[PDB]
Write a protein that binds this ligand. Structure first.
Ligand code: HEM
Ligand SMILES: *[C@@H]1O[C@H](CO)[C@@H](O[C@@H]2O[C@H](CO)[C@@H](O)[C@H](O)[C@H]2NC(C)=O)[C@H](O)[C@H]1NC(C)=O
Ligand SMILES: *[C@H]1O[C@H](CO)[C@@H](O)[C@H](O)[C@@H]1O
Ligand SMILES: [C-]#N
Ligand SMILES: [Ca+2]
Ligand SMILES: [Ca+2]
Length: 336
């Protein structure tokens, strides 16, 4: 019932500043509302901001981190020295400037930019957006971000401490549907993790289950595993999680339904967004976030591979009936 100066109708006056932030991010940060490297960097950032949260450290008399507190920006000098935070400073600086110019908290801005960026990627669900997180933060403790060479046990333990069940770890990894690497293997910059790095779809879950046959680069980078076709990169953590008895049935259940995947991801991102916070103390400004263009494409097994090339890892459920395609194997272009 609130009408912002802009003539947008919104639920609360605390949302009105976010319409200006929307316009700025879509023109500038997102280079005309695109789904390219900025959104992908922002998703690494939202994860690495929020996951600096450790009830186990708190329980052991230590600061455990403030979660989705914008610490990765406010204390970037410290946090961008962590192993998992390479290749982010240029994006962090862009966000810093936007937060200061519009006078919004860094923790809220990261969450907003996440929801806005997702909205530019076909097939995305509409992420919740809450405002009101204090701009105050202390540096995250070190060693809280899962790495691609970690065992499934280590990943589930860390994620579990933060608050996520194994199913939720799988659900959050839907973000690897919009993904590449730059820092693991320098010879294949922006090699995608799935065949559709600009579509928020189930391809990631399907393609990580295919037999690893292909070395996309002239050598291996850090935590790199064989992939199913030229141009695609596979990190060891994703390979293991796809196959591990603790995560494989949820991973398999993602393969055939973009709609269930999106719901699960939205729910898990909502939980992650308020690590360190009481969501009931925040204001819901989700109406600022528009819907994404719909994705009309069907799940597929690419390249004339079939279910026989799938390493079915959920021992109690048959692999879903997924369409196949013509060969030859594709060669993925670098993600834009
Ligand atoms: C569960 C453990 C996870 C591990 C070990 C992991 C590991 C990584 C690594 C090593 C990269 C490559 C970065 C580079 O070299 O450029 C990557 C990329 C990416 N990750 Fe994750 N990740 C995980 C979870 C997540 C989550 C929860 C999200 C966000 C919801 C996320 C979003 C992304 C995105 C979007 C990219 C692509 C970045 C790009 O294209 O520039 N990841 N991940
Ligand atoms: C959020 O807190 C940060 C850190 O104190 C503030 O960032 C500083 O902002 C000043 C004034 O604009 C800049 O001159 C500094 O470069 C910023 N420092 C860092 C580390 O980013 C920020 O202004 C605060 N935001 C709000 C809305 O109060
Ligand atoms: C096949 O072709 C793509 C480019 O079209 C590459 O990105 C890949 O590395 C392979 O050469
Ligand atoms: C991904 N970090
Ligand atoms: Ca943080
Ligand atoms: Ca995809």
């Amino acid at each position: 019932s609130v009408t912002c100066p802009g003539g947008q109708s919104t639920s609360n006056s605390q949302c009105c500043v976010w319409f200006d932030v929307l316009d700025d991010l879509q023109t500038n940060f997102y280079q005309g509302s695109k789904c390219e490297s900025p959104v992908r960097k922002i998703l690494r950032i939202v994860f690495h901001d929020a996951i600096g949260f450790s009830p186990a450290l708190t329980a052991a008399g230590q600061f455990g981190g403030g979660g989705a507190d914008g610490s990765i920006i406010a204390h970037s000098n410290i946090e961008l020295a962590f192993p998992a935070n390479g290749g982010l400073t240029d994006t962090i600086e862009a966000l810093r400037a936007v937060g200061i110019n519009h006078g919004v908290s860094f923790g809220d801005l990261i969450q907003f930019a996440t929801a806005v960026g997702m909205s530019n990627c076909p097939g995305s669900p509409r992420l919740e957006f809450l405002t009101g997180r204090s701009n105050s933060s202390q540096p995250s403790p070190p060693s809280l971000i899962p790495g691609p060479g970690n065992t499934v046990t280590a990943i589930l333990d860390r994620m579990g401490d933060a608050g996520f069940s194994p199913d939720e770890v799988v659900d959050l990894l839907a973000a690897h549907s919009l993904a590449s690497q730059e820092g693991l293997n320098s010879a294949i910059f922006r090699s995608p993790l799935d065949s559709t790095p600009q579509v928020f779809d189930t391809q990631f879950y399907i393609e990580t289950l295919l037999k690893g046959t292909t070395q996309p680069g002239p050598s291996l980078g850090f935590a790199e595993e064989l992939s199913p076709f030229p141009g695609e990169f596979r990190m060891r953590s994703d390979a293991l999680l796809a196959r591990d008895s603790r995560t494989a049935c949820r991973w398999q259940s993602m393969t055939s339904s973009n709609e269930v995947m999106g719901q699960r991801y939205r729910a898990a991102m909502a939980k992650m967004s308020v690590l360190g916070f009481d969501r009931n103390a925040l204001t819901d400004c989700s109406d600022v976030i528009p819907s994404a263009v719909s994705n009309n494409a069907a799940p597929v097994i690419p390249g004339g591979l079939t279910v026989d090339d799938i390493e079915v890892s959920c021992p109690s459920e048959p692999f879903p009936e997924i369409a196949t395609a013509s060969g030859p194997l594709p060669s993925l272009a670098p993600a834009p």
